[PDB]
Amino acid sequence: PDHELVVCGAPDAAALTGLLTRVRAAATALSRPELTDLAAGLAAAHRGDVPARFAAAVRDADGLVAALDRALGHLAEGGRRLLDAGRGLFLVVGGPLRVGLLFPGQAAPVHADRGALGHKPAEPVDTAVAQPAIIADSLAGIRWLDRLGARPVGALGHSLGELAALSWAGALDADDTLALARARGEAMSAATEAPSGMLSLRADLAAARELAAGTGAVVAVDNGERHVVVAGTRPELDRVAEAARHAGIEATPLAVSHAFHSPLMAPAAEALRRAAGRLPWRRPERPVASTVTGAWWADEDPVEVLVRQLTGPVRFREALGLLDADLLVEVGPGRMLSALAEAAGRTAVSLDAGAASAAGMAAGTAALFAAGAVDDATPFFAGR
Ligand SMILES: [Cl-]
Numbered sequence: 001p002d003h004e005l006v007v008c009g010a011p012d013a014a015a016l017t018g019l020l021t022r023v024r025a026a027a028t029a030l031s032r033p034e035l036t037d038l039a040a041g042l043a044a045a046h047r048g049d050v051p052a053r054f055a056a057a058v059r060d061a062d063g064l065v066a067a068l069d070r071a072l073g074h075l076a077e078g079g080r081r082l083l084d085a086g087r088g089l090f091l092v093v094g095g096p097l098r099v100g101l102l103f104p105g106q107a108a109p110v111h112a113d114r115g116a117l118g119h120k121p122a123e124p125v126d127t128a129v130a131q132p133a134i135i136a137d138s139l140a141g142i143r144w145l146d147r148l149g150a151r152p153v154g155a156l157g158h159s160l161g162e163l164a165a166l167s168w169a170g171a172l173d174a175d176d177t178l179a180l181a182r183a184r185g186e187a188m189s190a191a192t193e194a195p196s197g198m199l200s201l202r203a204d205l206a207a208a209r210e211l212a213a214g215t216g217a218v219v220a221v222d223n224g225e226r227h228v229v230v231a232g233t234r235p236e237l238d239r240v241a242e243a244a245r246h247a248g249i250e251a252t253p254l255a256v257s258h259a260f261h262s263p264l265m266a267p268a269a270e271a272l273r274r275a276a277g278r279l280p281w282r283r284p285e286r287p288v289a290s291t292v293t294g295a296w297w298a299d300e301d302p303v304e305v306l307v308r309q310l311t312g313p314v315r316f317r318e319a320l321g322l323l324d325a326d327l328l329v330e331v332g333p334g335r336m337l338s339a340l341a342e343a344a345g346r347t348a349v350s351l352d353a354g355a356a357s358a359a360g361m362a363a364g365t366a367a368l369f370a371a372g373a374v375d376d377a378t379p380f381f382a383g384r
Contacts, residue, residue, distance in 0.1 A: 103332055211244050218231060
């Protein structure tokens with residue numbers, strides 16, 4: 001792999017300082033094959049009940065020395081918790097912390113991302129192909145969490161990702177979930193009655209609703225205080241874009257040919273109802289914060305919730321606010337949701353399941369280990 005995972009631990013902060021000092025000494029100058037042997041040995045020896053924990057995803061020995069330096073500086077100032085998701089460096093004395101899962105949906109590309117600088121368009125996602133592809137990668141991430149014995153406090157899924165969150169929670173098995181994803185992407189790829197799309201606003205929900213009022217456009221995705229997506233026909237979207245320019249709000253056209261998460265998806269919701277109603281649904285056994293209801297999943301009829309998902313807004317701001325977690329780990333391809341969570345001031349890292357680069361699997365597994373959600377990082381060293 002292009003990133004290595006280096007974990008260790010000790011019984012308390014003083015003992016971890018001593019160990020980290022010695023690993024720093026040992027690490028200076030190691031070749032890449034020597035660093036892999038040191039990292040595989042540390043993972044074998046530091047598993048189980050490991051009270052005070054360090055984990056870092058690193059490109060090479062010098063990156064390990066740099067991470068150790070940061071951890072040691074933190075402990076020297078009496079720090080007991082350093083969570084730097086964007087550097088893949090995690091240190092926790094006195095955990096476990098609360099870890100939540102994020103299950104992504106489909107990518108949301110910008111139509112003409114500029115440029116020179118703003119200051120041929122992107123192609124929309126082919127949703128009939130993308131939805132089952134993303135859910136297959138999410139289900140592979142759930143198999144990694146299962147191999148690790150991960151113990152998150154709960155999960156949420158954005159739009160499509162709610163299917164993977166429910167599968168993780170035991171409501172539906174992996175084969176049925178992938179089959180339902182193929183049906184959902186086929187239903188949602190049908191053309192809308194008239195040309196339609198989505199418009200991203202750098203504004204909050206109230207500001208979006210003020211811009212959209214009387215226009216025909218509606219809120220499609222509430223991603224937080226800094227990001228709300230509206231949807232409608234092209235005339236409706238043009239009304240909002242005019243309003244947004246007058247108000248001084250930045251409106252970004254997205255590369256999509258459907259007003260997803262609007263009433264124009266009602267035909268697709270009917271077709272999804274047929275596919276969903278044929279499946280052997282079970283009650284979820286683990287907590288799921290729904291981006292359909294913006295509430296915890298309780299006694300809900302999954303067919304009704306997944307059908308109204310398509311016409312109603314994605315309540316990611318509300319669902320994320322419910323999930324009380326010191327650290328979030330995204331389980332799926334890419335880092336869409338970790339970026340949205342970071343924009344809400346949360347700490348998040350993606351496993352980036354199915355990626356060419358091992359960057360995400362190393363950083364995400366370092367996060368699970370340091371936060372105490374997994375006890376054994378040896379699976380990262382198996383089967384190379
Ligand atoms: Cl609302």
